[PDB]
Amino acid sequence: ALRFPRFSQGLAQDPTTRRIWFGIATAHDFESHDDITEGRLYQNIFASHFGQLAIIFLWTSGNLFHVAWQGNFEAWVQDPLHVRPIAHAIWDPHFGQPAVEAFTRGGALGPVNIAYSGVYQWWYTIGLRTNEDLYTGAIFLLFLSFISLLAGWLHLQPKWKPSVSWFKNAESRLNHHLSGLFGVSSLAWAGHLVHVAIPGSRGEYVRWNNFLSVLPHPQGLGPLFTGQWNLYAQNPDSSNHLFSTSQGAGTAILTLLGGFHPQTQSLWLTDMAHHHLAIAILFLIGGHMYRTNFGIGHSIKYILEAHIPPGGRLGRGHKGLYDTINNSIHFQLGLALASLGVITSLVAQHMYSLPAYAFIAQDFTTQAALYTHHQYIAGFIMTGAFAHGAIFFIRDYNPEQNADNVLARMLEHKEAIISHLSWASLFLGFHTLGLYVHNDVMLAFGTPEKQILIEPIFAQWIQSAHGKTSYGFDVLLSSTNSPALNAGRSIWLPGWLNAINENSNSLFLTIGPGDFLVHHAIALGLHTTTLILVKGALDARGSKLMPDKKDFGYSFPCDGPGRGGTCDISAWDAFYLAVFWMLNTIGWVTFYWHWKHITLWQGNVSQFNESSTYLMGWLRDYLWLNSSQLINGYNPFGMNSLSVWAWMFLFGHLVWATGFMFLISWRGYWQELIETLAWAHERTPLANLIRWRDKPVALSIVQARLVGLVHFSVGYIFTYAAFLIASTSGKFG
């Protein structure tokens, strides 16, 4: 416990280069450090969250700062559809003069990068107008970054270290997070929309210096407290309103219009203000559910304990689950990652189809990057959710205190669970691949009318229930006299029905056979990825091939070549396998999103409707067709601003392919090779004089799986991002 890994004398005493690698890789697994306590575990996590907040604030602060200092925000806000937004300046002494010219874009005086993050549309929509606005925002976030480090440091001091019992006060944290973290923040955010963002959209300029002397609504708070709330919806912006001007500007602050601001193609600010106010009220009421210090409220433990079906089909129901969850941080993080993963996908699905930010709908590359960025983030987050389920089962699960409850009963019938995921994955793979291959052969043989082309009738019927008329189903909101249509006719349905039946936005795009096939591809990916992950979690404690696996922990290289061979038998390896399947799945979903949109934006959805029912269509009319500008970002005839993406595109192919080395060749080959280099080094004059302080050894078995996975994932992402951005920005859809 005297060198580098101060938390692991086991590693500090490793005489090989392995010590340095594993010191880095295990630094955040607090539970496995020398002499951790429960208290220290919580306290380190708690301070680590403050450091993570500090980095988040610091990062946002720089984005603000770099846009204000080197971007064209002030020109963008005066002409948002004719100015490429600048991310930051570039200063690279390797550039030749033709690279300096090509990257000089926007209104800038030097080479710059164009921002595909959407922050200009975001900041503009919420009220930011001037570079100064951005500067003081950055300074404020810098202050928040600093404060977050102060509290982190503070709560690692003995006077301020919180006790385990405090970290386990679940009822109090829930009440505060629901009503305060969620509710008051949403209420306050509606306050910002009403006081700053909405006046900004109506050509007024409300800032800290003047916001006390200007009314958000001519009638003040009178209507709020008298109950005459309709007054706040009275005089909404015209459908001819020009954003950031008073032309057609109304006075409503809280509306329920549905649909889009026709010029900006994004949600009405007065709708978003009403939304944040409404959910705030719900969070604020909901945050009064649990008992704290006042003699009212619920006990979560008692609630769980009561929920046991009389009749016994769930054994002891939920008994014991409060302390199983409240005493296991991997259980908690599993639920956190699982939930955040669902809503990260929700964000991606809802933001492309119901954009909130003015002039982001027509910034095609931004919409492509934003959807792709969150679906990959969501995928990784989902794999972590199961990985920490597995870790929960090994480190924290107490069979006896969960005896016969719903959690133990999952382990009892793991073979039923796993073998049905297996069945569902087999069904979806055989038939989805079988159907695409059939269609390909039909195309190959000049007989496309012999394709199997199943109509996505169930989803089309759902779009019709939502009011889309494309399919003639005439259901619910597509009907003429459904009570559903009658109830909302007076409110949100005029603006919604308009948006859903406009076929040049992204709200509920028209779908045919091509959308059917790739949705079953997607269901294949979801089912197979969860198969790996569920099988991984449920066998983590033990299988017939290794019935004592729990005694070996989450990650171990294997259990040796006996009993027939046991490579990749740990729960950590099931995670490792699942990442490939998650990257596959998100690949399929993002390919689909992009190709559906690029043919939409180009004005010929029929290119997708026809070429997508067979796989040669995807290879040729999606990947090959859309690569031509990207791979010419530099050629024997010069280069252009697509040069970076052409280079990163190949960089991504290179990192990915290097991953294959760590994945295919395994350790023993390389350990023997390194030995001949140890010999050679100790027998080479002059070089004899120099000696290593760490014995060179081949990487560990597990290490190589990780290094390979990381290379594979990194090249996967960089290849697709380069293609996505170049193909979309080289033409603007």
């Binding site: 005297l2 060198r3 580098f4 340095i20 300046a89 200063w91």
Partner: peptide, 30 residues
């Protein structure tokens, strides 16, 4: 240009060299 010509070589050459040298001595210490 008057500041990028200062910070880009500082964060991309000096800081990594100072960091790599610092970490080399901590990891090698006994």
């Amino acid at each position: 240009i008057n500041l990028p010509s200062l910070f880009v070589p500082l964060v991309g050459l000096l800081f990594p060299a100072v960091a790599m040298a610092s970490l080399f001595l901590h990891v090698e210490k006994r």
